[PDB]
């Protein structure tokens, strides 16, 4: 895969060119923000059971044909898969935020998803919807703004990561 | 790319395992390194072409005889040649510096070097003797600072090696 | 044997824009644009290998440097100025080791 | 900078006398140049480091002294023009040329 250091040199390498200034110094802030990237990080982790629980139950309730006979979530076997899979949905995304780059996220889980998908019949709305829970749980807890659970850390903003965590969510659903 | 963080993601992918404190750990090990070895490719990108154009001319002072006819580098187009080959090996260490393993060296001039050079009859003791000149005028702290010789002159050792 | 570039003679008016080609038939990659000045200093004004750029004598964004070709190198010059009134020499050369080939060179006056 | 002096001589033939071109820096090799009445530059010397003879010239170069030197006998009425001496001096990227000198020959 490529990380954020190695996404500069593969586009440098296009024009056959030395690493310049102006790409140096981008990678400068990403190293003077690194402990932000690992402290980010390690919040999405520690809460990873609860996250994924979230995700797969808030789908279900907003849609209960899910679990109704003839559903995709209906017997033991699918409920054990759909939380299975969608925990290796959050697996990916904390590579992406730890490495800094979304081609991990794209070559290793997102590469043929869609058409496995169609061929299981797993419903693609339902899909995204549960997507879509995890990187709401995921930016709070990026953020420090969980309800009931809270993390003691250094004052500071975390926008930049917390904007980093929803693209990399949003490739999932737009990719499905 | 094999460098720090490559290694660790896909360690910890193979278990089947979140990112830990054990693999956290080792990129912090990057940002203390990334001050020195960010200071050595600036040093090479702004004098490329001072150092590959030297380097190449130790080469052939070494050994005089690849200028007759029948060897490599026996006319001037292959000359030049062989002195766009030293500017290649010398990018890649600038990438290896960056990207901070041996990622970039590995999959883009160390993997087919021994089938090309033996099937175009280019020796490797030619290559060996541009990197052995360059690696002896590097000092300290004319250069560079003290570690960051060290990061450059570890980059060198690790080509030469293969073409040993 | 030599480098051969048209047009030979080009004069013109204070508002106009003029533009050199220059052709080479060796086997050379790298080619010079020299602009010695009417006290017949050689000062480099750009260079070119390949399709990149590797000179820039702290030239003024008004000359632009057009190449197609590896035998190729144009100009075209923008709001042009008497003050830029000078002999213009095409070069040709290897990147890294051989001596340069010059052509006969073009003059450009500019009138009041 | 490069300094050239004196700036012109005129030598009768058979009189002897060098032409000599200062660098300030390393320099690997330098190109001398002969300017025609026609305005056009003709290679007349490529040398790295050697001695070159072509006629009755003949040229030298110290990498450790960094000097260039040139010497000229017998002139000859073909052998007017101005005389270049240029060096790759600097960052090795770009050729810097010096003052020049005019010879004229009388028969």
């Known amino acids: 895969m490529l990380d954020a250091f190695s996404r500069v040199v593969v586009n440098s390498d296009s024009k056959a060119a030395y690493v310049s200034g102006s790409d140096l110094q981008a990678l400068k802030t990403f190293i003077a923000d690194g402990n932000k990237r690992l402290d980010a990080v390690n919040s999405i982790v520690s809460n990873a059971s609860c996250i994924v629980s979230d995700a797969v139950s808030g789908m279900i309730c907003e849609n209960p044909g899910l679990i109704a006979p003839g559903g995709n979530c209906y017997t033991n076997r699918r409920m054990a898969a759909c939380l299975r899979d969608g925990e290796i949905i959050l697996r990916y995304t904390s590579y992406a935020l730890l490495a800094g780059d979304s081609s991990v996220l794209e070559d290793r889980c997102l590469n043929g998803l869609k058409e496995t998908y169609i061929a299981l019949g797993v419903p693609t709305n339902s899909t995204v919807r549960a997507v879509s829970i995890m990187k709401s749980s995921a930016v709070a807890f990026i953020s420090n703004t969980a309800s009931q659970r809270k993390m003691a850390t250094a004052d500071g903003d975390c926008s930049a990561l917390s904007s980093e965590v929803a693209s990399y969510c949003d490739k999932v659903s737009a990719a499905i | 790319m094999k460098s720090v963080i490559t290694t660790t993601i896909s360690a910890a992918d193979a278990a089947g395992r979140f990112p830990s404190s054990s693999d956290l750990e080792s990129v912090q090990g990057n940002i203390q390194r990334a001050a020195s070895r960010l200071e050595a490719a600036e040093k090479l990108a702004g004098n490329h072409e001072a150092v590959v154009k030297e380097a190449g001319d130790a080469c052939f002072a070494k050994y005089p005889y690849l200028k007759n006819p029948g060897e490599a580098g026996d006319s001037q187009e292959k000359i030049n040649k062989c002195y766009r080959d030293i500017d290649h090996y010398m990018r890649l260490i600038n990438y290896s510096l960056v990207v901070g393993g041996t990622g970039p060296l590995d999959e883009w001039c160390i993997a087919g070097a021994r089938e090309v050079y033996r099937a175009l009859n280019l020796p490797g003791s030619s290559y060996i003797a541009a990197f052995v000149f360059t690696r002896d005028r590097l000092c300290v702290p004319r250069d560079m600072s003290a570690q960051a010789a060290v990061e450059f002159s570890g980059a060198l050792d690790y080509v030469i090696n293969s073409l040993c | 044997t030599a480098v051969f570039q048209t047009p030979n003679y080009h004069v013109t008016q204070v508002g106009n824009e003029v533009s050199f080609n220059c052709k080479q038939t060796?086997?050379?990659?790298?080619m010079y644009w020299y602009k010695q000045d009417s006290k017949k200093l050689l000062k480099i004004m750009f260079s070119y290998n390949n399709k990149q750029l590797i000179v820039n004598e702290t030239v003024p964004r008004r000359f632009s440097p057009q190449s197609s070709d590896k035998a190729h190198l144009n100009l075209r010059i923008k709001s042009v100025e008497p003050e830029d009134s000078a002999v213009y020499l095409c070069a040709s050369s290897f990147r890294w080791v051989g001596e340069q080939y010059f052509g006969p060179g073009t003059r450009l006056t500019v009138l009041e | 900078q490069v300094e050239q002096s004196p700036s012109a001589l005129s030598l009768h033939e058979g009189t002897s006398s060098a032409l000599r071109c200062n660098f300030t820096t390393t320099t690997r090799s330098v190109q001398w140049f002969r300017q025609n009445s026609r305005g056009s530059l003709i290679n007349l010397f490529y040398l790295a480091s050697g001695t070159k003879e072509n006629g009755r010239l003949k040229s030298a170069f110290d990498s450790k002294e960094l000097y260039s030197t040139l010497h000229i006998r017998d002139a000859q009425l073909e052998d007017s023009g101005t005389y270049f001496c240029a060096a790759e001096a600097g960052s090795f990227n770009k050729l810097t040329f010096g003052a020049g000198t005019r010879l004229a020959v009388s028969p």
């Open positions: 060796l086997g050379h990659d790298t």
